[PDB]
Structure formats: structure tokens, C-alpha cells
Amino acid sequence: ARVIQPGETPDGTIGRLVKRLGAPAVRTATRQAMRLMGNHFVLGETIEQALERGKPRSGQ
Amino acid sequence: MPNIPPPFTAPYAPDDAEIAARLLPASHLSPPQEARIHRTATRLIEAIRKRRLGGVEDM
Numbered sequence: 001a002r003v004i005q006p007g008e009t010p011d012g013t014i015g016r017l018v019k020r021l022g023a024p025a026v027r028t029a030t031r032q033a034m035r036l037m038g039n040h041f042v043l044g045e046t047i048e049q050a051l052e053r054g055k056p057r058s059g060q
Numbered sequence: 061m062p063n064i065p066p067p068f069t070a071p072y073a074p075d076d077a078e079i080a081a082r083l084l085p086a087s088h089l090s091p092p093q094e095a096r097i098h099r100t101a102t103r104l105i106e107a108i109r110k111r112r113l114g115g116v117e118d119m
Binding site: 021022023024025028 | 102105106107109110111
């Protein structure tokens with residue numbers, strides 16, 4: 001948990017995005033990225049985690 | 061109590077440049093005035109770009 005001081009120059013890939021689209025649109029875009037990553041990729045810190053996450057219901 | 065103004069009759073299509081010669085200098089604002097405007101306006105546009113259903117332009 002950091003503490004973000006106001007008036008920070010928007011830099012970086014995200015800061016440049018924020019300057020261009022505005023912070024609210026970046027949040028919205030990030031939320032969309034979250035549904036894409038969650039729905040279309042089967043990922044984990046290790047292969048075991050990915051595989052467990054990608055499993056079907058049962059006897060299926 | 062003042063006089064009822066005469067029927068309106070301003071020149072229909074005066075020269076743009078002469079108008080601009082008046083409006084351009086008068087439009088000047090101090091740095092702090094512009095700073096408030098910039099901030100308010102950025103906040104308005106951020107809200108606009110939040111994205112609600114939409115409007116005709118969106119369609």
C-alpha cells in the first residue's frame with residue numbers, strides 16, 4: 001500500500017494512456033482486459049496452477 | 061424608463077478579421093485562470109470518456 005501524491009506528471013505507458021484517454025477510460029479498458037485475460041487464457045504461476053484452473057467439471 | 065431601442069439593424073456580414081482583432085486580445089487569461097479552466101475541463105472530459113448507454117453520435 002503506497003500513498004499517491006496529487007499532480008503527478010502522467011508518464012509511462014499507463015500515464016501516457018491516462019493523459020490521452022483520461023483515468024476513467026483507462027480503468028474501463030483495464031477491466032475489459034481483465035475479462036479477456038480471465039476468459040481466453042489459462043494461466044498460473046506454475047503449470048500445475050494453470051492446469052488446475054483449466055480443468056472441466058467432473059468425469060468430463 | 062430608458063428609451064425603447066430602435067428596430068434592430070446591425071450590419072449583416074461584417075469583416076471577420078476586424079472582429080478577430082478585437083476578440084483575440086480580449087480573450088487573454090492569466091496563468092492561474094487558465095490552470096483552473098484546464099483542470100475543470102479535463103475532469104469533465106474524463107467523466108465523458110468514462111463510458112452508461114450512449115447517444116446518437118455513439119450510434
